[PDB]
Design a protein around this nucleic acid. Structure first.
Lengths: 106, 161, 123, 185, 97, 87
RNA sequence: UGUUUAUAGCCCUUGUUGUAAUACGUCCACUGGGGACUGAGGACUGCGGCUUCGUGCCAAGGAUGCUGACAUAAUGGU
RNA sequence: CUGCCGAAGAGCAGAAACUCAGAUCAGUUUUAAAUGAGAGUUUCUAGUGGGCCAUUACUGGCGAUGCGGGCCGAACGUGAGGUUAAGGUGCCGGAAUGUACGCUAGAAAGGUGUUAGUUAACUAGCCCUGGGCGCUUAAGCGUACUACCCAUACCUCACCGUCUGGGUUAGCU
RNA sequence: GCAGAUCUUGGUGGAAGUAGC
RNA sequence: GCGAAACCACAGCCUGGGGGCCAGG
RNA sequence: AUAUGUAUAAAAAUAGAGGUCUCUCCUGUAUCGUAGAAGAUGGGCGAUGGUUGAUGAAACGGAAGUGUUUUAUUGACUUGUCCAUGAAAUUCCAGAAUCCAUUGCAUACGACUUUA
């Protein structure tokens, strides 16, 4: 209704990992409405970001953003692999990410 | 997927032996033929050679037929003979059902099963299976069972009717 | 009211023929059935019931009919525009059309539904 | 599509399937509320789950159906970790339907429904009746409260439908709905 | 890479000269600001970068050459005055622009 | 079985065959005319065992409803009550 | 109940529309896109390709070009 | 401190000296040549001559050996990316609550329990008797076809090191 | 060129304000 | 009021499987 | 005593329900809201609309009712429709209790019962 939103909601699922070894350098991101690796091909290369609060007024704001990028699909059920400029904290599992629509090709 | 293959071979004017067997690809067919020939006329694999390996399609793939299949089982005792009938539209289609059925009921493997003969029974009287006869009734009409049908957490309960 | 039988017309929901309309010609077994359609792009094939929904419409058809005669039977009994008569097809075609609008057409619908809501006249 | 709070009607759902669906949602940061937990269904005859529970009775032994489901989710979560304990606090499993939740939409999980997962004729147990036999003694009042809520909700639906009749009639009354109906709406 | 190309009907733009819009036209003012070492301290000399008149004139000229094209075809004026924004249930991987 | 169908009103709403109930066993009723075509579409031998009982139970209830007599020396209910009375 | 296309049609053989079609297998020194990682080397030497010859040009013996943001900061560490 | 070589469990490991594709070899195979590798020698001079496991005294494996799975897989410089083995994809847990075909606790003989067959009797399978949560047209069991997950393994590139081979002086602006 | 030799020497702990007078 | 000493890798919830390991309570 | 529109409420069955002998289901890819210098400044046409903020109320909600309406005003916006001005060089993303005292229905000591 209000609008002014140009992003697709996403969740930080977990890191890339085997059963016992984890890799914080790549993260697993589930995007809203993307349920297959065929649809996940659309969101590759898009810019995904994590936005959170703080306490210090960095340039007069309490907001902080960690940018990223979608790299490849993961699995069959629409999960994707996202690389972030700084590896996301482990405390942000299940948090809400923002998948912008740029760079765009459609 | 399984495929019908006609294998003809003979030892290096020796008699030519041709037979129809079902294999996933040609290489399995030729080895299977040699194993079958080894236990029939005692011809060595190394001595013999294959003269023709051809793939066979279904002449009438869109017509429902009944196939009677005679096979040899290997069990705990390793000696058994059965005959089963399947209704489908392809000779290879019934064979997959035959292999799936026996691996299900009798816990079989592809190696322990050898096809003795497969025939197409076109006479309804010749059918010896009650299920086959029932499926061939002129008034065959039954509701579809076992239907049951991401988007988890659907909004309304399924109709399922 | 939906009995899998010879002559019943079914709608394919899986594979590359989703949304195509076909009619059972023969019952292969308890897991498969042979279907056909007057439409040329629909070939004669044997498929399982897990890919179809049983349409309540029933057409009279001899068992094992060829593809060409099936089209004549379909034309004779006018199955076309009879399937579309039911609200089922109308919703499906409306959804199919609603999957094609670009941003402009969606913005036109924005205005249209705005021209329709403003009344809300009640007694 | 995911949002922050969901209410799930547990009637006609299998215990394991629904709990596994719920557990995966909780670890994803989604707050989940399950209502009517005493209408949950379990595959197998009544005695089978009955001997399972009495074996468990032979650790705190809890009889309520809502806490039977809560234990099922708990085993499916990393409860020994701070992450798992955080997820568990996001789950509110209740019996019946509390008044704060009866005025909100309730979704169901097709992957967990008993009708879509159990062969017809298969015997199945109900958690509510199983709990009522192992020590739970509140199913009389819960059932009675269910009838009152169902009656009140039924009246609301009739009022909603009656109001819906006016707008539905006025829909085709306006020629705009048919002027550009080609858009599919 | 930062624009969504829609299938909306194209606007007649052949009637406006565009060859004047080059790399130099859009470039930014090269760093300069000729200053002396008494006003840089007590920094009150900074002018403003208000867009000059000819930029306004070019914008008005473009508007004159574009408005009839968008007025003739319906809904263009309201479409362009609008903004694009997503809502619940909108899936960009399936919406056809 | 593939089709083990058998035979006031016969209304079969919600598997209740109110003329009575048939919810206990999945067998169809279909209320075919005066009869109730109690169909079985590829079910299980338990369904075949139930239909033979259900057919007699429905017939006994129908016979009892039309004329239950006394049979001193509700069909199953009367017989169980008589056995309970005897005990 | 019994019959042989009629007021349904079905199965088998041949001819024909036949240089059918499609599926499958395989190949193209055919071709159109999307995404990610990397940029080692440091004048020219070479192998090639276009171009009339050209200090000619080139995707050819390893990345360049065009921009933007910051010094009260951006960035990176403890 | 780092690097390199490296056992044993007379032989096995190096160093000098020589003689060398125009030379002989081989934990190999065919026949009664194929293929891989440059082959050797005299001399000395350290270390050890335990045992255990498994298949058939032999053979390996353990031992001086970490890594993935839970014996199977895999021989390890520092990393980026890709792809896999074994094992897996309901949740814990990365990955299909995949598709298709089937049977019904599960991962000597008895049974009026069941399903397919042979000639009332037998054959075959499941049930009773003699990691967690949970699961039931499965998330159990068997077969088949796809997709997916990730090892210190494989491939590509960067970098460190070692080894082997080559270049480099009228020291050319 | 030290982490250890119930290492040597010195210093300081918990026991503990305990046992105890 | 006075006031030790021996001793001390580290510490202290159970069950099962291989006093901290694995899975649960 | 003191969080990016945070939208969507019948029951029961999958071998039947709902609504008026007839009709519908076969998921929400639906429905409500969705254009505005982050939502500016004006004019006309058509209905008594819609969205609300603040007062005044009365009816309903007890399972955890903390919410549902009906409204009587007041103050705004209104894109229902069609026109008139403004956005820019952000010149390509970032008043109690207790102690003291007291009671013995209590009591190793606390605690309890009392008063006090």
């Amino acid at each position: 209704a209000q609008g002014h939103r140009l992003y697709v909601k996403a969740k930080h699922l977990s890191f890339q990992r085997s059963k016992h070894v984890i890799h914080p350098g790549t993260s697993i991101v589930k995007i809203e409405g993307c349920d297959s690796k065929e649809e996940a091909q659309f969101y590759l290369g898009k810019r995904v970001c994590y936005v959170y609060k703080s306490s210090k007024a960095v340039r007069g704001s309490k907001i902080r953003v960690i940018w990223g990028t979608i790299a490849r699909p993961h699995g069959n059920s629409g999960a994707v692999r996202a690389r972030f400029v700084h590896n996301l904290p482990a405390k942000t599992f299940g948090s809400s990410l923002r998948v912008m629509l740029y760079p765009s090709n459609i | 997927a399984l495929k019908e293959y006609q294998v003809v071979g003979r030892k290096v004017v020796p008699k030519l032996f041709r037979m129809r067997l079902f294999a996933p690809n040609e290489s399995v067919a030729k080895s299977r033929y040699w194993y079958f020939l080894k236990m029939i006329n005692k011809v060595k694999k190394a001595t013999g050679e294959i003269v023709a390996i051809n793939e066979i399609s279904e002449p009438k793939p869109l017509k429902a037929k009944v196939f009677g299949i005679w096979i040899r089982y290997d069990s705990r005792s390793g000696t058994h003979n059965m005959y089963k009938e399947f209704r489908d539209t392809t000779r290879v289609g019934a064979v997959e059902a035959m292999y799936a059925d026996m691996a299900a009921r009798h816990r079989a493997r592809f190696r322990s099963i050898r096809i003795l003969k497969v025939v197409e029974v076109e006479k309804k009287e010749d059918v010896r299976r009650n299920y086959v006869k029932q499926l061939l009734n002129p008034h065959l009409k039954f509701p579809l069972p076992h239907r049951r049908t991401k988007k988890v957490f659907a909004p309304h309960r399924p109709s399922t009717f | 009211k939906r009995y899998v039988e010879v002559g019943r017309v079914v709608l394919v929901t899986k594979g590359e023929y989703t949304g195509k309309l076909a009619v059972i010609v023969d019952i292969v077994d308890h897991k498969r059935a042979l279907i056909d359609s007057p439409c040329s792009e629909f070939p004669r094939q044997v498929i399982r019931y897990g890919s179809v929904v049983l349409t309540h419409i029933v057409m009279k058809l001899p068992r094992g009919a060829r593809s060409g005669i099936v089209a004549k039977k379909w034309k004779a009994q006018d199955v076309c525009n009879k399937w579309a008569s039911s609200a089922w097809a109308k919703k499906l075609e409306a959804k199919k059309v609603r999957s094609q609008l670009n941003d402009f057409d969606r913005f036109a619908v924005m205005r249209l539904k705005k021209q329709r809501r403003e009344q809300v006249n009640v007694a | 599509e995911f949002q922050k709070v969901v209410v799930i009607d547990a009637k006609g759902h299998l215990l394991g399937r629904l709990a596994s669906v719920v557990a995966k949602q909780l670890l994803g940061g989604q707050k989940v509320v399950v209502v009517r937990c005493e209408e949950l269904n379990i595959s197998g005859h009544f005695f089978r789950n009955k001997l399972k529970y009495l074996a468990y009775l032979r650790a705190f032994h809890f009889r309520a159906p809502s806490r039977i489901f809560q234990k099922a989710v708990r085993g499916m979560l990393p409860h020994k970790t701070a992450r798992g304990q955080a997820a568990l606090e996001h789950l509110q499993a209740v019996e019946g339907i509390p008044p704060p939740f009866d005025k909100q939409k309730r979704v169901v999980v097709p992957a967990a429904l008993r009708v879509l997962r159990l062969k017809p004729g298969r015997k199945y147990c109900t958690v509510g009746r199983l709990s009522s036999e192992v020590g739970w003694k509140y199913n009389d009042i819960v059932a009675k409260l269910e009838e009152r809520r169902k009656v009140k909700s039924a009246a609301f639906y009739q009022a909603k439908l009656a109001k819906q009749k006016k707008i539905a009639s006025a829909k085709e009354a306006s020629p705009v709905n048919q002027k550009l109906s080609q858009f599919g709406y | 890479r930062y624009v969504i190309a829609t299938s909306a009907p194209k606007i007649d733009v052949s009637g406006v000269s565009v060859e004047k819009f080059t790399k130099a036209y859009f470039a930014k003012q090269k760093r300069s600001g000729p200053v002396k070492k008494d006003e840089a301290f007590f920094a009150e000399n900074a002018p403003k970068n208000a867009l000059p008149a000819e930029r306004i004139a070019d914008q008005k000229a473009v508007d004159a050459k574009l408005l009839p094209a968008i007025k003739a075809i319906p809904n263009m004026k309201e479409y362009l005055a609008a903004s694009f924004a997503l809502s619940n249930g909108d899936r960009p991987h399936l919406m056809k622009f | 079985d593939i089709y083990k169908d058998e035979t006031v009103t016969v209304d079969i709403k919600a598997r209740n065959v109110t003329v009575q109930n048939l919810r206990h066993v999945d067998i169809e009723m279909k209320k075919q005319g005066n009869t109730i075509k109690f169909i079985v579409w590829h079910g299980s031998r338990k369904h075949n065992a139930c239909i033979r009982s259900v057919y007699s139970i429905i017939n006994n209830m129908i016979i009892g409803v039309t004329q239950g007599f006394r049979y001193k020396m509700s069909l199953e209910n009367v017989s169980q009550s008589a056995a309970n009375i005897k005990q």
